[PDB]
Symmetry: C4
């Protein structure tokens, strides 16, 4: 019976039947957004949902017999596994993000279809040749975030009060979003020289970030 | 008479006459902006308009005899047809956008002058090599937009209350416009961890967008 | 005496003396900024100023005999001419920007020192390649500016009231600065569909702008 | 004893031991952030802190007996010396920033580990091929900063009242952060034509900056 199912799984129908479900459940999840649609057809789509979740475990099970150990060393499969697992944890208990993380299954349209897979893979593969920079930056952020916490946190706790807050504000400055009117100008009303900490921080972080982009244009 | 008009139409004078009209109607449309100019010479400009709009249909009518099926297979020609058509819909009824959409005819200066055509074509040609990434993001936006509507839309309906609002707000975060002061910091007053949804969202969307530019920097 | 002066002007010492003056008149202008410094050395600086202006017209006159027609076909020389000329209009009559535009002469440090010239020339040379796009954009800006003035300027005259205002606001949207909180979110409280005019505008203008940069990254 | 200590210094164990201390002191400094942790275990920390500082001077002393002049001609060695130096000035007197600047020793992780050194050196190496442009810009900023201080600093002294302030505001405009709503729109309520100073400032500065990036996508 092994080869019987291995012929069902690898079957074009089966794969295309999955893709067909994803695009339906996808459509169904955006409808679950509407408070109106739920008061009409809520019970409809809740069954339809639990239905699909079964079909996906059945599939992921069948998918496993056909592949065994090979499957738990496939990125895309592991994904599909973990994303279905999330959808299995009972519609209750613990944290309620689990009801919300369920929409991560629509990322299966990425897994279950090449070209998507291509592009994702194209994208991801650029990451390792960035990790040197990413390391440098994180160290940099870590250092300045500490300095900032101990230079502005006392008068400005909302923004620098805690190591994490400073991380956040520093990230915010790096995206240059409202950095001068929102932060440094206020800061300067008390710490006139605070510009000395933030202009350099901006030059460095943006310089590095430009390099990181030109890096991905020579690779 | 066929070859007679095919020598009128295809003539230098003809094209340069059309171009001469465009640049003239264009100037006329910037003048229709001034409430002053209209209280003076409004009658002048409304007739001038109907005049040019006639001339353009005559031309588009002529243009079709000389070309038949070749014409409704020319991007640029179809454009002019569609654009002139919009300008034909009476100055009344339906929506007023139609009255406003008329100014789209000034895009004929692109259609009816090479180099422009070249440049436009240069640009448009880059698009198909982006559709994979574009597909990817549109899926991504859709997934997060749904997630956001159900994580934040109750306490924050202006921004995430509806699927559409979430799309809009998410777009806004992507342009990095006022994302931290305007949205996340507020969100965090109630959902302390909301940062865990938006920072990753920003890395992903920024990263992708960097690649999409690096792609166009090789093709 | 022609070759006598042509050996004075073309002389190293002459150039290095001009340069030495620029950097001094430069420093002196940053000091004319201080309200304090003027109350102590204002006369010193106004005299020093009138002096240098003479020295520069002498130079520009000499430079002319040594070059004649060759001079008024040199960008860099013409610049120095026009710049010095500006500095010549008396400390009165007319507009008062003329008194302010005087500081444009510090751009002589660029004109009269190779290396700057090189880089400047390196920069300017990129512009011709961009004019097809720049034309395209300007046409586009002109078209949307007109649409905006007639779609939004009745309720929103600060931002779209006049063809020029719209230009400005549209420019602002293109720099993405505060475009959603500042403008479109407001517009939508009255024109729910305004998003349909601004999202496309943003895509197009940012797309083009990405091309334009990638263009320069090839020529 | 020389070759004894030369063998100790050059020893893998020694370098790795240093690296181990850095990652421990690093973790310590992030913990020194918590007012809780400090009440509990501050003593533990400040002493562990002083210990590390001793070890590092010893190391830096040893490192010099083994390199002499070769050391003070090594950027990385110089760095380390100057950083530990900072950390050495007592926990009192002068400017309390020194106490804060101590955290700069965590940059030793960069210096004591290659790959980091590689990346940093990769990064820095790009700077000289930029100094022509940087000089250009700095001249530019200086000229406009002066113009602004004298065109706007009387009615708008927060932003332009001083050469320094104008420098800051001009930088802010360059990052495009809040430049229209924050500054020019206000400015224009008094100086209608102020747009003529800032749109050009923006074009130039953005253009130059695009060139600078493309310059690094060649070199
Ligand atoms: Ca911004
Ligand atoms: Ca802002
Ligand atoms: Ca504000």
């Amino acid at each position: 019976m092994y080869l019987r199912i291995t012929n069902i799984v690898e079957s074009s129908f089966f794969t295309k039947f999955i893709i067909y479900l994803i695009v339906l459940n996808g459509i169904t999840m955006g409808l679950e957004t509407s408070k109106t649609f739920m008061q009409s057809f809520g019970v409809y789509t809740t069954l339809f949902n639990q239905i699909v979740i079964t079909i996906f475990t059945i599939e992921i099970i069948l998918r496993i017999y056909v592949h065994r150990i090979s499957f738990f060393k496939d990125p895309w499969s592991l994904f599909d596994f973990f994303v279905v697992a999330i959808s299995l944890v009972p519609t209750s208990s613990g944290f309620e993000i689990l009801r919300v993380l369920r929409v991560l299954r629509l990322f299966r349209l990425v897994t279950a279809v090449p070209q998507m897979r291509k592009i994702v893979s194209a994208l991801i593969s650029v990451i390792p040749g960035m990790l040197s920079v990413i390391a440098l930056m994180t160290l940099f952020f870590y250092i300045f975030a500490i300095m900032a916490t101990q230079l502005f946190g006392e008068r400005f706790p909302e923004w620098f009060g805690t190591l994490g807050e400073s991380f956040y504000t520093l990230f915010q400055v790096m995206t240059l979003e409202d950095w001068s009117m929102g932060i440094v100008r206020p800061l300067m009303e008390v710490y006139p020289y605070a510009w000395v900490f933030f202009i350099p921080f901006i030059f460095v972080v943006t310089f590095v970030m430009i390099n990181l982009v030109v890096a991905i244009c020579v690779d």
